[PDB]
C-alpha cells in the first residue's frame, strides 16, 4: 500500500503478534470468557503493546463497536488531574453501548468498555491517585488498560490493581519469523545472516528492524542490480560504526598519550557517529575479549555504565566520549 512497512505490517488479530506468548495466550483465553482484568502493559519500545491492545479491541468488538466502546487517551491530549476527574469518570459511569444484531451474531461482545491510557507513566501522581478509586469502583462496567514503558513512574496502588503483562524484548530468536515473513511477502533478497544482524542491531525494537529492512530494500531498488543485501549495507544504514574505526579507537586508548586521544576524538565527533552505538561497541569489544584480566573488565564495566547513564540524560556526546576514553586509557 501507500504506507511504511511498519504501519502496513501491523498485526491485525492476536495471532500475528510474534513472541509475547504469555500475554497473547492469556488475552485469547480471556476472549472466550468475560473476566478481562485491568491490564498494565509494559516493556521496551517496539515490543508490541499498542499492536496487542488494538488487536484485542478488534477481536472483542469488531470495527463497528470500536468507536463506541473504546476510549483512548495519549499524551496528544492533556491528562492532568481535572480531565481524569471529569472525562474519565463520566465515560466510566456511562452504560455500555447497545450491540447490533450482526455484532451479536459474529463477535463475542463483552458487557464492558475498555479505557486505554497510552503513556500512563507521563501522568502526575495526583492524576493516578484520582484514577485509583474510579478504577476500583466502576470496574463492573468498564476496564482500564494502562500502557507505559516505565513501571516505576506508576504509583504502587495502580500497580497493585492492574494486572501486569511484561512485554519481552524481541531478539534474533523470538522475532526472526516475523522478519522472514515480511521479507518473503515484500520480495526482498538477503543473505542468510542479514536478518539476524538486523535483529541484533535493534534492542527489542522490531519496529526499528522493519525500518532498517525497508531502507535496505529501497536502496536495493534504487541500485536496481538485483543483488541480495549484504550485512555491510545494513550495518552502514543502521549507523553501526565500522570495526576498523573501533580497532583504531582501541589502539589509541591502549597507547595513552592523552593529546592524541583528544585529537582522534575530535575527528571522530566530526565523523558524526552517535555516542550510544560507540559505547555499545566498546562494551561488546572489551567485555567479550579474552586479552584482558578480571580487574580491567571490573573497572571498565562500571566506566561504560557510568558513561551510558550520563548519556541517557542528554548531555554533550563529545565530552562524555572523551572522558570515557580517557578513563579507559588510564586503566
Amino acid at each position: 500500500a501507500q504506507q511504511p512497512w511498519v504501519e502496513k505490517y501491523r498485526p491485525k488479530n492476536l495471532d500475528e503478534v510474534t513472541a509475547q506468548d504469555h500475554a497473547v495466550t492469556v488475552l485469547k483465553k480471556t476472549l472466550k470468557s468475560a473476566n478481562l482484568p485491568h491490564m498494565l502493559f509494559y516493556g521496551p519500545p517496539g515490543t508490541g503493546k499498542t499492536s496487542t491492545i488494538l488487536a484485542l479491541t478488534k477481536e472483542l468488538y469488531g470495527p463497528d463497536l470500536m468507536k463506541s466502546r473504546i476510549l483512548e487517551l495519549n499524551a496528544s491530549d492533556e491528562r492532568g488531574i481535572s480531565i481524569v476527574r471529569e472525562k474519565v469518570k463520566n465515560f466510566a459511569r456511562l452504560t455500555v453501548s447497545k450491540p447490533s444484531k450482526h455484532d451479536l451474531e459474529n463477535y463475542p461482545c463483552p458487557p464492558y468498555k475498555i479505557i486505554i491510557l497510552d503513556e500512563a507513566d507521563s501522568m502526575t501522581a495526583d492524576a493516578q491517585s484520582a484514577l485509583r478509586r474510579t478504577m476500583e469502583t466502576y470496574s463492573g462496567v468498564t476496564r482500564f488498560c494502562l500502557i507505559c514503558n516505565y513501571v516505576t513512574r506508576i504509583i504502587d496502588p495502580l500497580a497493585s490493581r492492574c494486572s501486569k503483562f511484561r512485554f519481552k524484548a524481541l531478539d534474533a530468536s523470538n522475532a526472526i519469523d516475523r522478519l522472514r515473513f515480511i521479507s518473503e511477502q515484500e520480495n526482498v533478497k538477503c543473505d542468510d545472516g542479514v536478518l539476524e544482524r538486523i535483529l541484533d542491531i535493534s534492542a527489542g525494537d522490531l519496529r526499528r528492524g522493519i525500518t532498517l529492512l525497508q531502507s535496505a530494500s529501497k536502496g536495493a531498488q534504487y541500485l536496481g542490480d538485483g543483488k541480495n543485501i549484504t550485512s555491510t549495507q545494513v550495518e552502514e544504514l543502521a549507523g553501526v560504526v565500522p570495526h576498523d574505526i573501533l580497532i583504531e579507537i582501541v589502539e589509541k586508548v591502549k597507547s595513552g598519550d592523552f593529546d592524541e586521544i583528544k585529537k582522534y576524538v575530535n575527528t571522530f565527533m566530526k565523523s558524526g557517529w552517535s555516542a550510544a552505538s560507540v559505547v555499545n561497541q566498546l562494551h561488546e569489544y572489551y567485555i567479550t575479549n579474552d586479552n584482558f584480566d578480571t580487574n580491567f573488565k571490573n573497572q571498565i564495566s562500571w566506566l561504560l555504565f557510568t558513561t551510558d547513564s550520563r548519556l541517557n540524560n542528554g548531555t554533550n556526546e563529545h565530552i562524555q566520549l572523551l572522558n570515557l576514553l580517557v578513563k579507559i586509557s588510564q586503566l
Binding site: T152, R153, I154, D156
Partner: protein, 320 residues
Amino acid sequence: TLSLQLPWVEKYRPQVLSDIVGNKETIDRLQQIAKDGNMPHMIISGMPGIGKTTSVHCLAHELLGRSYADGVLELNASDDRGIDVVRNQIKHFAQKKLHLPPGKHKIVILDEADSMTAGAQQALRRTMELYSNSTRFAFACNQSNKIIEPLQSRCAILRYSKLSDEDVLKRLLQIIKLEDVKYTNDGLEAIIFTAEGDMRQAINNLQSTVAGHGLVNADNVFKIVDSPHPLIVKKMLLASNLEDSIQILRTDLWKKGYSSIDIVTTSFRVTKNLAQVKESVRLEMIKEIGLTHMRILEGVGTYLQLASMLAKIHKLNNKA
C-alpha cells in the same frame, strides 16, 4: 445501629481554669485576667494537643457565664473565613450593642488562625484598632509565624509549652479516679512515653487500651499502639555496625508495612533534629538522605534504595 459512648477527650474536657494543668505562670495569668475582667487581645500558640483552645473556651465561659451565647463569636477554618465574610460578620459583631457587665467585654475567638488569608488579617488589623473598648480578639494557632506582624503588635503574645510527664501523669490519675479502671504503673509509663507530651494522644491511647483489653498494662498498650517511627528511625541512624542498621530496618520498618516515603521523610526529620553528632556529619547525612528521597519520589521505591542510603550513611560514619 448501636449507640456510642462520649469519648474521654470531651467527656472530661475541663470547664474551669483550675482544671487545666500545664504552664503554671500562663494559667495563673489567665486566672488573674478572669478575676480582673480587662482581657487584652491574645495570641495563644503551641504544639497540638497541649490545651490551647480549651483554655480559651474556659476563660470565655468564666468571663461571660450569662452572655456566652450572645457576646462570644466562634469562627474557625470550617467557616468561610474570607474577606467578605470576615468584614461583614466581624463588623456586625463588633458594633452590636450588648450591655455586658462593667469588667466584661465581647470576645471574638478565632480557632486555628494560622490558615487564615492575608487580606482577612489586614482587615482584622483595622477592626481591632477601631473596636477595642467593646470587643477583644483571641487567636489560637499552632504556629504564630503565619499571623502577620501588626496583629502580633496589637495583641499580647502568650505561648504554651509541651507538658512535662508529671502533669500528664497527674491528669491521667485524675481521670482514672473519675472512672474505675485497673491499671499498671508500667502501662501508664508506656502511655506517657507514647504520648510525648500530647495529652489528647495520651487520653486516646488510654481509652483505646481500656476498650480493647480492660487492663492498662505495658503489653496491652504496646499492642494497641506501636512504637513511634521517629524513635526506631533514630535508633537505626545512630547505630553503627551497618548490618545492625540493615536488620533493624528490615525487621521494624519493612515487614511492619511502613512506606519507603515515610521512612525517608522520618529519617530526614530525625537527622535534622539530631543533636548527638556534630554539624558536618548531620549536613552530609541530610545530603545523602535527600539524594535517596529524590530517587524515591522519582518512582524507584524499593528496599534496596533504603539499604543503599544506610550504607552511604555508614560509610560516612566510619570516615571512609
